[PDB]
Design an enzyme around this catalytic site. Structure first.
Site, PDB file in Angstrom:
ATOM      1  N   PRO A 124     -20.918  -8.254  -2.963  1.00 48.36           N
ATOM      2  CA  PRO A 124     -22.343  -8.651  -3.137  1.00 48.36           C
ATOM      3  C   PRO A 124     -23.234  -7.987  -2.132  1.00 48.36           C
ATOM      4  O   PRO A 124     -22.812  -7.553  -1.027  1.00 48.36           O
ATOM      5  CB  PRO A 124     -22.333 -10.155  -2.869  1.00 48.36           C
ATOM      6  CG  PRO A 124     -20.975 -10.569  -3.382  1.00 48.36           C
ATOM      7  CD  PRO A 124     -20.040  -9.394  -3.186  1.00 48.36           C
ATOM      8  N   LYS A 174     -16.646 -15.204  -0.639  1.00 48.78           N
ATOM      9  CA  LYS A 174     -15.913 -13.947  -0.399  1.00 48.78           C
ATOM     10  C   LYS A 174     -15.778 -13.682   1.089  1.00 48.78           C
ATOM     11  O   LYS A 174     -16.608 -14.104   1.908  1.00 48.78           O
ATOM     12  CB  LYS A 174     -16.648 -12.799  -1.055  1.00 48.78           C
ATOM     13  CG  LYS A 174     -16.916 -12.987  -2.507  1.00 48.78           C
ATOM     14  CD  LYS A 174     -17.213 -11.694  -3.204  1.00 48.78           C
ATOM     15  CE  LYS A 174     -17.542 -11.882  -4.632  1.00 48.78           C
ATOM     16  NZ  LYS A 174     -16.375 -12.354  -5.398  1.00 48.78           N
ATOM     17  N   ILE A 181     -20.971  -9.033  -8.716  1.00 51.50           N
ATOM     18  CA  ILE A 181     -20.168  -9.052  -9.948  1.00 51.50           C
ATOM     19  C   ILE A 181     -19.701 -10.487 -10.121  1.00 51.50           C
ATOM     20  O   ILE A 181     -18.860 -10.985  -9.343  1.00 51.50           O
ATOM     21  CB  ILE A 181     -18.987  -8.099  -9.817  1.00 51.50           C
ATOM     22  CG1 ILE A 181     -19.476  -6.634  -9.698  1.00 51.50           C
ATOM     23  CG2 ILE A 181     -18.082  -8.276 -10.999  1.00 51.50           C
ATOM     24  CD1 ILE A 181     -18.427  -5.644  -9.221  1.00 51.50           C
ATOM     25  N   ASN A 195     -34.721 -11.607  -6.836  1.00 51.18           N
ATOM     26  CA  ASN A 195     -34.187 -11.304  -8.108  1.00 51.18           C
ATOM     27  C   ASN A 195     -32.631 -11.256  -8.039  1.00 51.18           C
ATOM     28  O   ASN A 195     -32.080 -10.581  -7.149  1.00 51.18           O
ATOM     29  CB  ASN A 195     -34.672  -9.924  -8.583  1.00 51.18           C
ATOM     30  CG  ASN A 195     -36.138  -9.878  -8.992  1.00 51.18           C
ATOM     31  OD1 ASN A 195     -36.880  -8.951  -8.613  1.00 51.18           O
ATOM     32  ND2 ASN A 195     -36.552 -10.838  -9.679  1.00 51.18           N
TER      33      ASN A 195
HETATM   34  N1  LIG Z   1     -19.271  -5.898  -3.705  1.00 50.77           N
HETATM   35  C1  LIG Z   1     -18.214  -6.109  -3.896  1.00 50.77           C
HETATM   36  C2  LIG Z   1     -16.799  -6.369  -4.180  1.00 50.77           C
HETATM   37  C3  LIG Z   1     -15.732  -5.586  -3.422  1.00 50.77           C
HETATM   38  O1  LIG Z   1     -14.517  -5.584  -3.733  1.00 50.77           O
HETATM   39  N2  LIG Z   1     -16.193  -5.003  -2.251  1.00 50.77           N
HETATM   40  C4  LIG Z   1     -15.390  -4.444  -1.249  1.00 50.77           C
HETATM   41  C5  LIG Z   1     -15.944  -3.462  -0.475  1.00 50.77           C
HETATM   42  C6  LIG Z   1     -15.234  -2.897   0.595  1.00 50.77           C
HETATM   43  C7  LIG Z   1     -13.923  -3.344   0.869  1.00 50.77           C
HETATM   44  C8  LIG Z   1     -13.361  -4.338   0.060  1.00 50.77           C
HETATM   45  C9  LIG Z   1     -11.983  -4.829   0.306  1.00 50.77           C
HETATM   46  F1  LIG Z   1     -11.412  -4.104   1.220  1.00 50.77           F
HETATM   47  F2  LIG Z   1     -12.097  -6.060   0.677  1.00 50.77           F
HETATM   48  F3  LIG Z   1     -11.275  -4.964  -0.622  1.00 50.77           F
HETATM   49  C10 LIG Z   1     -14.063  -4.881  -1.014  1.00 50.77           C
HETATM   50  C11 LIG Z   1     -16.434  -6.948  -5.467  1.00 50.77           C
HETATM   51  S1  LIG Z   1     -17.615  -8.008  -6.143  1.00 50.77           S
HETATM   52  N3  LIG Z   1     -15.139  -7.009  -5.853  1.00 50.77           N
HETATM   53  C12 LIG Z   1     -14.789  -7.499  -7.097  1.00 50.77           C
HETATM   54  C13 LIG Z   1     -15.093  -6.695  -8.199  1.00 50.77           C
HETATM   55  C14 LIG Z   1     -14.821  -7.108  -9.385  1.00 50.77           C
HETATM   56  C15 LIG Z   1     -14.213  -8.394  -9.644  1.00 50.77           C
HETATM   57  C16 LIG Z   1     -13.937  -9.243  -8.595  1.00 50.77           C
HETATM   58  C17 LIG Z   1     -14.243  -8.723  -7.263  1.00 50.77           C
HETATM   59 CL1  LIG Z   1     -13.876  -9.697  -5.824  1.00 50.77          CL
END
Ligand SMILES: N#C[C@H](C(=O)Nc1cccc(C(F)(F)F)c1)C(=S)Nc1ccccc1Cl
Ligand SMILES: N#C[C@H](C(=O)Nc1cccc(C(F)(F)F)c1)C(=S)Nc1ccccc1Cl
Lengths: 114, 114, 114
Positions: free
Chosen positions: B1, B32, B64, B97
């Protein structure tokens, strides 16, 4: 199509010619003439990614069509590649939001594309 | 996010730990780990709200999932609260938004989240 | 409603009262109260449009309703007309993305509009 990058990288680290490089590579990637491509780079921003101030970018690509699962994976590889090579931003510190715009929802030259 | 706030509050009025605070609060609010959160604050903006240059903010939260009626009310209370306490912006001069992004439409690390 | 313009025009070229002019014209065009209109103008940006750094703009209009085919054509004529008259930007170097927001996805004053 239009590509925006917001980044905490300083202005001095954006190389000469970068906006022209992005224009060309996006024209090729989307199949659109370069006349249709707009680019916008915003350096020196106050941002954090994953809790860190290490270089990062928050970006968007809007297009009328030419957006989809496989296309967007390809744009991500291209664009992350450019941000890594030219602005020294790790690909894992970039988000790119993709928007498939309805022609009726894009204004240009006193009207819309619908 | 990812959370972006654009404001006409001057930069010197943004407190030192503000980006860290937003990161931690949004990690809790979206459920998260902090790795998943990006934050961007843009002060000193030329803006009006209701015709007035008094302190205001225009913000966005992209995720997402984790977007919906009740969630977004909760985010709005949280984030208006932070902007009131830390930046001295009235809640009634804030728009946020919310965007529920498809995983296929979010690029990261040379690919997308799909 | 919320109107944002990002442009490479320098700040000194933005006339006094421009944000009030936008606020009035957008209130009249959308039929929404001027007190509910927010405007944000970002000059001095590093941008290209069709590969060229001649004056250009990248804009957005978000509204809860009052977005549609005919309405957007009318907004485009209005807004390109203001950017040409006041900022000396050619209408053919402006994009405006229109967004019809669900009320549940717009935060304000500690809640959402739903
Ligand atoms: N923004 C964002 C994230 C994401 O995975 N960001 C992310 C960005 C950098 C590193 C890492 C990790 F190392 F934790 F995995 C994660 C999202 S919403 N992840 C995700 C995508 C699709 C479905 C479910 C999730 Cl958690
Ligand atoms: N962005 C963008 C463009 C667009 O036409 N931009 C554009 C921008 C500048 C000039 C010119 C022209 F005058 F050369 F046609 C075109 C898009 S996606 N065009 C388009 C709209 C709807 C359907 C198909 C297309 Cl190619």
């Amino acid at each position: 199509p239009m590509f925006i990058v917001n980044t905490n990288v300083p202005r001095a680290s954006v190389p000469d010619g970068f906006l022209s490089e992005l224009t060309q590579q996006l024209a090729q990637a989307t199949g659109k003439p370069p006349q249709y491509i707009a680019v916008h780079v915003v350096p020196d921003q106050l941002m954090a990614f994953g809790g860190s101030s290490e270089p990062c970018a928050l970006c968007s690509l809007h297009s009328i069509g030419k957006i989809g699962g496989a296309q967007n994976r390809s744009y991500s590889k291209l664009l992350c590649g450019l941000l890594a090579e030219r602005l020294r931003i790790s690909p894992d510190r970039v988000y790119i939001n993709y928007y498939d715009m309805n022609a009726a929802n894009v204004g240009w030259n006193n009207s819309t594309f619908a």
